[PDB]
Amino acid sequence: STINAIVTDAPKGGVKYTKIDMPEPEKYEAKLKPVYIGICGTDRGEVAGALSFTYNPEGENFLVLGHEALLQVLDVSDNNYIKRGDFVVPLVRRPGKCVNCRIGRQDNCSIGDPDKHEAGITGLHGFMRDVIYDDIQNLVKVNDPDLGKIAVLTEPLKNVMKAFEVFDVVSKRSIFQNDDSTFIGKKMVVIGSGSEAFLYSFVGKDRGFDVTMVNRHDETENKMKMMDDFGVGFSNYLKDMPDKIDLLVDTSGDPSTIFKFVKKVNNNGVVILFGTNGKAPGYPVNGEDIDYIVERNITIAGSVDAAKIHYVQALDSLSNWYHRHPQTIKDIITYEAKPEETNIFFQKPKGEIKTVIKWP
Amino acid sequence: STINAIVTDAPKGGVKYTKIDMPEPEKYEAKLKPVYIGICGTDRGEVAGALSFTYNPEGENFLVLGHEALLQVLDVSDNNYIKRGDFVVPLVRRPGKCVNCRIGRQDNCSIGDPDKHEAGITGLHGFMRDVIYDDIQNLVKVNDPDLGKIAVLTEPLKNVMKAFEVFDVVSKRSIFQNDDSTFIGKKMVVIGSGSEAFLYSFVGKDRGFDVTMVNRHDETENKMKMMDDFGVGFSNYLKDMPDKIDLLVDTSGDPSTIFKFVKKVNNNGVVILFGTNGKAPGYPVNGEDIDYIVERNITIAGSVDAAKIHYVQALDSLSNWYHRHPQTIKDIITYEAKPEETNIFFQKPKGEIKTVIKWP
Amino acid sequence: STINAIVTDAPKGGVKYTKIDMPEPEKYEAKLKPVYIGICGTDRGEVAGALSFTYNPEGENFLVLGHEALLQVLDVSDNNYIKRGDFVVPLVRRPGKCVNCRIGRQDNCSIGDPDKHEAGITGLHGFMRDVIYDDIQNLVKVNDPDLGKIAVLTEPLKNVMKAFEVFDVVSKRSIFQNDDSTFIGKKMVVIGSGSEAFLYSFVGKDRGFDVTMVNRHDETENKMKMMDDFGVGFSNYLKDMPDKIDLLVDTSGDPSTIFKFVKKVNNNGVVILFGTNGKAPGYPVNGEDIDYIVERNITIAGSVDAAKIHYVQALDSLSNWYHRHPQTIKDIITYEAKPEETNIFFQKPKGEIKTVIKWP
Amino acid sequence: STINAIVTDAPKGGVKYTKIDMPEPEKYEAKLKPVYIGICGTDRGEVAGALSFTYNPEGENFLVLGHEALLQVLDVSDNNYIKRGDFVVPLVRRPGKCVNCRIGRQDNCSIGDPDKHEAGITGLHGFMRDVIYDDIQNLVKVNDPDLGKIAVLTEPLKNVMKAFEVFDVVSKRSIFQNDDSTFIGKKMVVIGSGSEAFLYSFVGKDRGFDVTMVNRHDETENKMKMMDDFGVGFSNYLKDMPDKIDLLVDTSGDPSTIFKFVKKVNNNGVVILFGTNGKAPGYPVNGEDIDYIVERNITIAGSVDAAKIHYVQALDSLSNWYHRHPQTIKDIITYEAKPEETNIFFQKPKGEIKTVIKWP
Ligand SMILES: [Zn+2]
Ligand SMILES: [Zn+2]
Ligand SMILES: [Zn+2]
Ligand SMILES: [Zn+2]
Ligand SMILES: [Zn+2]
Ligand SMILES: [Zn+2]
Ligand SMILES: [Zn+2]
Ligand SMILES: [Zn+2]
């Protein structure tokens, strides 16, 4: 069977909305269709040919892009969980055979490649294509009927849910809370201000943190209004440098910013490294920096990807925010594009939060 | 009264053995004297004037040095735990008022200076003087009467015990062990080879790791034998660079070395930053270094001090080790100096691991 | 000054809505008045004279009842959290000196009476009175303006939240989840059909469990509709006895019912004991029952009270629930009484879930 | 092949030392013989036909007994850990495919019989036989050459190390320690005085608890000195009942004794149920009993088996105990039987703590 799809040639790079030949399967559990698809710097990165670990599935010449999906079930085997017309989010990372992979924690794989594989990124076709085939275990059912396009933010949000679990593990080193058991006054600072930063901030707000997003420039008003709505502050760190940080999260991947901010972190502080950029210039870390970290019992936790449970938590969080802030949540999506507007892979509008592809 | 002591002028530096007027405090439960005091880079740093966070007590001009102590109780009020003639190890760090301090976790003080104080380093008189006064709760009784001078290693070891608690805490983020529940074949690498590296390595072996100590040069036969006695490996990383590290503990405090090794750490790897050196040159950390740490879910934790429980577990490990390998344990204590010999704070004795001051 | 208050003579019994002496205190940060006050088996129990561990404050021959409050501020010392006009839920348990009390976990006090105290129960006037004095610290702000009278359910729900933390802690002894990381299909059974049962059920659903409430009698349509709306099931256990239980929660206090459901619990199951009935009769537990608990690595855990963080967390779940389902959440509050209707402390009003007192 | 073995008919019972025909499988990594085999209640029970959950391996009309083994490697494929001549302790319980089994925590199997199987007990041949084939990974190496026969206590001790993990996991629901961070004066009571109860007491001593073993009768003078030499107290609870218990361990399996001691447990106290007895009578558990558990936040945790890591810990503790109290440790082994002495499965030889069979 022949369909439309947005493909790349991984890692060489490039983008193309074209038609490819998809065969059928033998014994398939599920047939699905895209409805919305989100995009982040990973996609623009793949297209730029800036990612050195990505590849096409074995034997093939191309890779179908897209990992942030919101699908609908075209057909399924009988099961207690989903049926035709239900809406689902698909799992990006699939398990291998390592001690972590065999228990649904492929996000914490002990080998790396090629034990596990990410859809749209590493040797496994993504979701920007008219027809998709999968197993029910890999699908996370959207139970909230009112969510609509908002559900597509599940994929990006689950990364934050995992990272926050990693926080909960590692903050058990000491008592992070107050005298009274609470997070009140506790300070989170999120580097950057794109969708991820937003999600990170929203969740920290749920967790009781006082949250400030930050950048090396003033932001657009839509973003400013968004941060305002949810009780999130903002600071241009060239004008006003936030001090006394309890939880620091980097979505930038930039060492100068990271470590500059690392030096503002309080005793028992936790820093989460999430954002990545292979090209970022080196920043000189010295004896005093390491001493700073050590003398304060600080933890720097790199975090990547997530387990299925974290997709469930992501969806339940989007429900809570929807029914409390319907409008402004809607406005996390800052542009909706047809599949042939491939310019979105190369462009970077001021004001962007999330860009999605409404699928025909 | 007038007593003899070895003192410095914190943070400026220098040392002397001399008489000082030490007034008997207002309240106290215990009156003691030293038997042995160990020294390390901290003591030497204090004297070199290389530490800017140190300071003499209030109203006073000098600072009695010494944190690594083994004392004998001269007199003590009636209690259930210690009797006159008992030997004990004193707490370095004393609690302030924060939420970690007030539960006995001043090692994880939420404020830092000046909520917590450390005897001999920060505004609190150390243990190289004739008479010392204290509270019973701040004294850790030595139960094993065979340890003698070995008990003086309680202080340096307790920092290792806390660094291992931290490993136990942050390792719960994934499943670290093999799929048989054990740590067998899991590669622990320790940068450096001094007293702290040894203590690390011995505890690491007790925890079930394959342990390799490393340095930028080959080691003495005497130290090799000691290592070999505990089944600990040694490698010159300029002649044979270890790879696939699961637990990395640095005692150098050197950024370039720290990050060179970080780049060999496996998925789910944990890096303990322990060793500090403010004057260590700057190493440029780039976007790939950050990405490495991110894609591998690696945790970098800095660790300082310990709780009283860690002293208790330190003493017990010394007991287990001494009764298994008396000779190797004796071999750590490589010189027994008199107080008059203040030069030991300036020049490093021939083949040092642990230098100690026997107190008259 | 003279105020109105509902009061008892504890532990003796009885209740009256009367007038009382209230001297304006010296030391107070805040001045509040009740808006709504809820009641439960505890309130009836005190009034019935059935709780032998309750008592009046020192040198007073009455105890103002009421522990489940929604208050409004009248005057407050300057501070960045709460202002005149704000609504707040007061803390019930107050901390003493123990190692858990001093870190805001009076909930887990390690001493019991008289190191800790509960408003309305043990030595501390409750909240059914015209004027309350308190400290800012003991008050939790309600930030959701739509919540109104639904916030009064905070005190009951925070006990659930704590029990789930208890579950979250003890369930770490093994891997409780599916090999997909999820709780999908994990069976939760709540003994009882009361307000507490419902609260647990809703939290359990939020947690991913299949949840079933059980009583020894059939239920109403008012109640069943409410359960259905939240995806919660119901079964009369005389007609159908649930099996294969992963998390059992008892709100009844009845041995016979507890241990009968205990013997339907899976390997690694957790049982939460929450409800209390000192008057419930013995049920013979034999060695075979014990062996059953052992061989399945089952945990049986008592949970009482909660910490401030669990109030905050409670309030946040109620907004979530109210905003997803305003109907059935309104439907929890089955009667609004005036203070003079002191008959609600003797007779279960008709079809009760939660009886509140709307204050003048 | 035809070899000597001690066998039963599970579950009917019965025992004899005889000749049997054991095949060698098409796959195995190691070939071993026994050196020492321990016996406990489970063996005696098996013989009496008191355990209907026991059964012979698939296709066989008999069950080779014995699960507490010290074996020696006769031949083993090349590997980095064990060689011909080394002494090992074989794994009892072997995993299936449940989420816990597949990561080497078959001790916490989510399914039970038959995911998992125990050697000498459930569908898997035991260790009282001339020749044993196994895979390397089911073997745990004895690295202390001095331990000799004492290494046979590994199997009953590892059950103690796992129950202490359980205690560690569940005592995290609050702060269990004193406010100095220690366990000093924390009160451990162990019900019973058998081998299992000694093992619990010594580990408890290492963990910092003040420990007492109890029974409903006086104990032998030899037992008393052994206790005394480790600093463990004894008490006849019919003359002197302990109160204010922090850790309670039951090795009896008797309800009446469990629940009357539970009644002496402090706030945040932990109860471990370990001991089993299908024939112990019912004790009537009332709502006061349930109320006492709930009000004190007590946790009652059933514990069975252990992971491989716990066999390594047991081995390490035995080394530590043996090297500091050689005599007391040897006294634990109170009879060394020939395999012809099958009467030991029917009668307990006099003053028994641990009976072992010395294999020829
Ligand atoms: Zn993305
Ligand atoms: Zn894997
Ligand atoms: Zn030192
Ligand atoms: Zn502090
Ligand atoms: Zn209540
Ligand atoms: Zn308390
Ligand atoms: Zn046994
Ligand atoms: Zn299993």
UniProtKB/TrEMBL annotation, chains A, B, C, D:
Residues noted as binding Zn(2+) 1 in the record, renumbered to the chain: 40, 67-68, 155
Molecular-function GO term, any one: NADP+ binding
Catalytic activity: D-glucose + NADP(+) = D-glucono-1,5-lactone + NADPH + H(+); D-glucose + NAD(+) = D-glucono-1,5-lactone + NADH + H(+)
Binding site for substrate: 42, 118, 155, 159, 305
Residues binding NADP(+), per UniProt: 193-194, 196, 215-217, 237, 251, 254, 257, 274-276, 303-305, 348
Ranges for domain Alcohol dehydrogenase-like N-terminal: 29-143
Protein's GO biological process: galactose catabolic process via D-galactonate; non-phosphorylated glucose catabolic process; protein tetramerization
Protein name in the entry: Glucose 1-dehydrogenase
